[PDB]
Each structure stands twice: as structure tokens, then as C-alpha cells.
Write a protein that binds this ligand. Sequence first.
Ligand SMILES: *[C@@H]1O[C@H](CO[C@@H]2O[C@@H](C)[C@@H](O)[C@@H](O)[C@@H]2O)[C@@H](O[C@@H]2O[C@H](CO)[C@@H](O)[C@H](O)[C@H]2NC(C)=O)[C@H](O)[C@H]1NC(C)=O
Ligand SMILES: *[C@@H]1O[C@H](CO[C@@H]2O[C@@H](C)[C@@H](O)[C@@H](O)[C@@H]2O)[C@@H](O[C@@H]2O[C@H](CO)[C@@H](O)[C@H](O)[C@H]2NC(C)=O)[C@H](O)[C@H]1NC(C)=O
Ligand SMILES: *[C@@H]1O[C@H](CO[C@@H]2O[C@@H](C)[C@@H](O)[C@@H](O)[C@@H]2O)[C@@H](O)[C@H](O)[C@H]1NC(C)=O
Ligand SMILES: *[C@@H]1O[C@H](CO)[C@@H](O)[C@H](O)[C@H]1NC(C)=O
Ligand SMILES: *[C@@H]1O[C@H](CO)[C@@H](O)[C@H](O)[C@H]1NC(C)=O
Ligand SMILES: *[C@@H]1O[C@H](CO)[C@@H](O)[C@H](O)[C@H]1NC(C)=O
Length: 526
Amino acid sequence: IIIATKNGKVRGMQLTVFGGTVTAFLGIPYAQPPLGRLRFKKPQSLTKWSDIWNATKYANSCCQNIDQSFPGFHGSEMWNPNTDLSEDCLYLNVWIPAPKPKNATVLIWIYGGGFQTGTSSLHVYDGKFLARVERVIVVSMNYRVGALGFLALPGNPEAPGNMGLFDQQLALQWVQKNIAAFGGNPKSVTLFGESAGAASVSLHLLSPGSHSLFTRAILQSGSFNAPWAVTSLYEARNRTLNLAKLTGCSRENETEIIKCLRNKDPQEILLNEAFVVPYGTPLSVNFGPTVDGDFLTDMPDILLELGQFKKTQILVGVNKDEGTAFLVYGAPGFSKDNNSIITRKEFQEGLKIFFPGVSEFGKESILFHYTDWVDDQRPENYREALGDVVGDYNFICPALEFTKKFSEWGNNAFFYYFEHRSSKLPWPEWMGVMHGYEIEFVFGLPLERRDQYTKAEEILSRSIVKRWANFAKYGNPQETQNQSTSWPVFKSTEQKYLTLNTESTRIMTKLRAQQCRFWTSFFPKV
Ligand SMILES: *[C@@H]1O[C@H](CO[C@@H]2O[C@@H](C)[C@@H](O)[C@@H](O)[C@@H]2O)[C@@H](O[C@@H]2O[C@H](CO)[C@@H](O)[C@H](O)[C@H]2NC(C)=O)[C@H](O)[C@H]1NC(C)=O
Ligand SMILES: *[C@@H]1O[C@H](CO[C@@H]2O[C@@H](C)[C@@H](O)[C@@H](O)[C@@H]2O)[C@@H](O[C@@H]2O[C@H](CO)[C@@H](O)[C@H](O)[C@H]2NC(C)=O)[C@H](O)[C@H]1NC(C)=O
Ligand SMILES: *[C@@H]1O[C@H](CO[C@@H]2O[C@@H](C)[C@@H](O)[C@@H](O)[C@@H]2O)[C@@H](O)[C@H](O)[C@H]1NC(C)=O
Ligand SMILES: *[C@@H]1O[C@H](CO)[C@@H](O)[C@H](O)[C@H]1NC(C)=O
Ligand SMILES: *[C@@H]1O[C@H](CO)[C@@H](O)[C@H](O)[C@H]1NC(C)=O
Ligand SMILES: *[C@@H]1O[C@H](CO)[C@@H](O)[C@H](O)[C@H]1NC(C)=O
């Protein structure tokens, strides 16, 4: 139960799952901790050790602001970090099947959180059910978020930008050099993540230094062409210097600002991160991926459009009600505690919150496209409209356009539409199939009947886990043995996609066709 890696021995622990055993190695370090001189730098290789590292508990989460908008509410607190925050957080986790497999496919998980939050130690990210049920090895890693992971002064190796993407990339290399010792096949590595984690997975498809570190990709509710995912390199510099003044760290030697920011206390940087943008939205990515000239050599949209990415199979998908979660973090007349029926003027107020820097005409064009009704006095007309707007603009339409663009360079792609509202979902029912609430199905939590899910949820999670596993091993997300719906390839022309629900599973075409022609062709011009 001790494994010898390239930097020394590590001790794990075994776990009982479904009357079998999984071996967990929680908290293997994969880089020299990025403190002091190393804060804001790319991660550095990890010096050998001759003891036995004890990988028996999750390591520290990375520094980050907590969501304190619904204290005590499980719906928001289940996403808050559940281990000590620290700048010493570059660690990873590995769940291997027991008995040790011999050439197992490796699934590498990248959590979301808008590039400002998240941690690999969340309960819904527990890879033990996947290791037990599909006999894959599951790896997740922590990576720097917010200013600590994405502060950008282009070219300056003191704060080059994209450091958190490089933490991810060094985790992938760790798996390349070391996963053979755990019984895994480095030649069969599938990346999957959700939200900002999905956008990260898509950026690894573009970054040449990641080409050789993984085989396939799975993108849940996210991609790099979402409007919140990448920021221009000049908007990045404006933000790092606005943080510089806010901490009184202003200089004309850019390098001297960095070493000034290197002496400030993480809490001081965290509490100023929010204000480096002129007007915030509940979707703001204050510090995030940029075109840095190293991880990312051009605007991702050019690279996607011109076929400059890793050629491979992708699995891409979204939830029915991506946008609702954000409405109760700032939209007036909205609350998780009533059913949030809003008015036409409340709707228009909501647009100013989510599209603050957008012209009067832009906002009416949004209102005009979403507010001519199949019936004008459904009292929830404007409430549903505002949720669709946020979800279609921020998630569904970027994921559809990514998939279109990706598949027209010849690779197989599969698109799902997740529309089961979980029975354990703590938010009110008007919020529907919320952002992030497919993750528990992917990780196979409903497989554990000890814990509150209907039998129908267990069965739906059982096939999702099988399709995901079959996609990782074989490049094809079919459930073959149980007479399931066949998942058609998503072609650029007909655009078939698969719906995922408890009743049964249907092939449909051209998800949100009218809404996406608005968002992806009209609205970019305004
Ligand atoms: C680029 O940065 C300037 C400077 O930023 C601001 O100062 C920070 C400390 C923080 O308080 C931000 O909210 C400020 O915006 C921005 O310039 C300003 O515009 C805002 C409102 O638009 C105004 O409050 C400030 O007085 C302006 N500051 C100056 C120095 O004139 C600017 O908006 C940023 N954005 C872009 C796109 O360049
Ligand atoms: C739904 O609730 C929102 C606000 O949630 C509430 O906040 C307090 C007002 C309190 O009543 C809590 O118990 C509620 O759950 C309501 O929005 C408020 O409306 C008033 C109207 O005078 C306005 O002044 C406030 O700013 C609003 N609060 C906001 C925008 O956060 C809303 O009216 C409720 N609607 C329904 C149909 O129940
Ligand atoms: C590492 O841990 C050793 C203890 O072994 C076991 O660790 C966990 C799983 C506990 O359940 C404990 O009862 C076990 O015996 C220590 O002997 C060793 O000193 C530790 N090393 C370091 C560096 O802390
Ligand atoms: C694992 O599979 C690869 C091909 O996918 C092969 O080249 C390698 O030798 C295998 N290793 C084993 C079976 O230990
Ligand atoms: C000041 O800036 C120059 C580049 O213009 C740089 O070479 C120098 O190292 C900076 N000062 C310090 C103390 O590093
Ligand atoms: C197939 O169906 C059986 C029930 O007949 C179920 O127990 C099994 O787990 C299913 N397999 C998959 C991959 O869903």
C-alpha cells in the first residue's frame, strides 16, 4: 500500500466501496510550493524526498474568497472549500482500483469555480465510485485560482499569467511520468471538468505543451469561447495594476510592483480582487486565462476557427437551466426563498446587472428576442426569460459553437443535454436543472443507495458513468449491453444530441437554434 514515484515513496490508504476496495492517495504534491519568491511564478519541479510521504488526507485548498451569500445553506456551502486554505496547495489525488489494475484508463478531473474558486476535495468530486465501478484510475489536482493563479503582466516571468493553467499542466505531466506505477496507462488519459474546469480542458486542447499529455476531452457546461473564459491581454494588465494601486503597490518598474505584491498578505490580495473591474456581474472572472504568448499563443477563437488544436474525440454538454443559479446573486426581485416572479421592468433591471457595459440598443435587442411570448401573461414569463438569457449567452451557445467548430475538422464529437433535476437538490424548484448538478451523476454518487437518491437516479447515474467510461477508454460514449439509445455523432450539419433524463433518452437536433443565432452572430456585433 506504498508506491514508489519518481520523487520518492508515498503511502496511501484503502477504502471499502460497494463491498469492494479502492485505494486512495490523497494529497500527493506535484510542485514546489509557490510561496515567497515563487508566488505568481510558474510552478517549479518538485525536489526528491527520501521519507515516505503520507497521502492519507486531502491537502490544503488554494487561497480564494468564500461564497457567504447564503450562510448555512447547503446549496451554496457544498461548493465552498472543505480544507484549509493555503498558498501551499499544489497537490493531487489518485483513486486506483483494488486489485491494482495493469493498464487502466486514467480520468483526470479539473474542477470549476470561475477560475476564482474550487478545490479537488469536494464531496461531489470523490473519485472512489468511478474507480470501483468502471475500474479506471481517477486523478484530480488543485491549481491556483484568482489573482494568485492568473495575475498577468505579459512577458514578465514574475507574473506572466496563466499560472493556474500551468499548475494543471504540471499535474498532467506528473500523471505521464508516474501513473504507470499505480497501474494506469499514460497513453489513455481523458481530461474532464465542469464550468471553468471545462473551459480549462478546452484550453488544453489548444495549448501545444499539453498536446502530448492527454488523449481525449470531456467538457461539462463550459468552454474557452464562453464570454467569461478568456480576457484580452490589455484588459489583464489594466486589472493587475488596478489591484496594484488598491494595495498601494504602484511603481513604474513592473517587476517592482510584483515583488511589492509578493510581500502583501494573501487576505489583502483577496479582498481587493473584486474591485479591479469597473462594474461587476455575478459572472465576473476578475483574474483568469489570458493570451500570454506561452500557454496560449493567440486568441482562442482564431485557433478554433482555423483548426489549430489537438485532433481527437470530445464529449460536450450542458444542463437545462444553466443560468438560474446566477439570478439569486444579484438580479432584483429574485430569491431562493420565493418563486421569484418578476415584472417586465424587473427583467429590464436584470439585463443591466448581467450586461452592464452593453448599449441601450444591445439590451433592447436582448429583450426583443426573448420577450415575445407563446402567451403574454404567464406570470413567470420574465423570470424564465432572464434565466434563459444568462444560460444561453454564458453556457449553452458557446458550448454548441465550440462543438460545431471542433467537429468540422473531422473529429467525432458527442453532445448531451442534461435535464434531470436531482431529488436532493436544495435550491427551489423554479431554478430547475441547475449549473453543476450533473456532476454528482457523473461521479456516481446516486450509485450509493445509503444516501437519498431515487432508484431512477441510480439507474441514470449508472449509464452516465458507463458512457463516460466507455468514452474515456474507447472514444465512444455508448452503453452497449442494456439495449440503450445509441449516442449519435454530432455532425456540423444536422447537430444531433442526446438528452439525459430518468424517464428515457432521446435523440434531438439543433439545440436552441433560434437563440444561438442571436447570441453567436448578432450580439457579438453590438
Ligand atoms: C482600466 O483602469 C482604469 C483605472 O481604474 C479604476 O480604479 C480601480 C482602483 C478601481 O476602483 C476601478 O473600479 C476603477 O475603474 C479604469 O478607469 C476609470 O473608470 C471608472 C469608471 O469607468 C472610474 O471610477 C475611475 O475614476 C476611472 N479611473 C481613471 C484612472 O480614470 C478603467 O475603467 C479600466 N477599464 C478599461 C476597460 O480600461
Ligand atoms: C421575492 O423576494 C425578493 C427579496 O427576497 C426578499 O428580501 C426581503 C425584501 C424579505 O422580504 C425576504 O424575506 C425576501 O425573501 C423581493 O424583492 C424585494 O421587493 C421589494 C419591494 O418593495 C424591494 O424593495 C426589495 O429590494 C426586493 N429585494 C431584493 C430585490 O432583493 C420580491 O419582491 C419577492 N417577490 C415575490 C413575488 O415574492
Ligand atoms: C506516516 O504515517 C505512519 C502511520 O501509519 C499509518 O497512517 C494512518 C493511515 C493511521 O491510520 C496510522 O494509524 C497508521 O499506522 C507514521 O508511522 C509515520 O511516522 C507517518 N509519517 C509522517 C512523515 O508523518
Ligand atoms: C498498455 O497499453 C499500451 C497500448 O495501449 C501498450 O503499448 C503498453 O505496452 C501496455 N502496457 C502494459 C500492458 O503493461
Ligand atoms: C527595473 O526595471 C528594469 C527594466 O526596465 C529591470 O532590469 C530591473 O531589474 C528593475 N529593477 C529591479 C530592482 O529589479
Ligand atoms: C444493466 O441493467 C442491469 C439490470 O438488469 C443493471 O443492474 C446494470 O448495472 C446495468 N448496466 C449498466 C451499464 O447500466
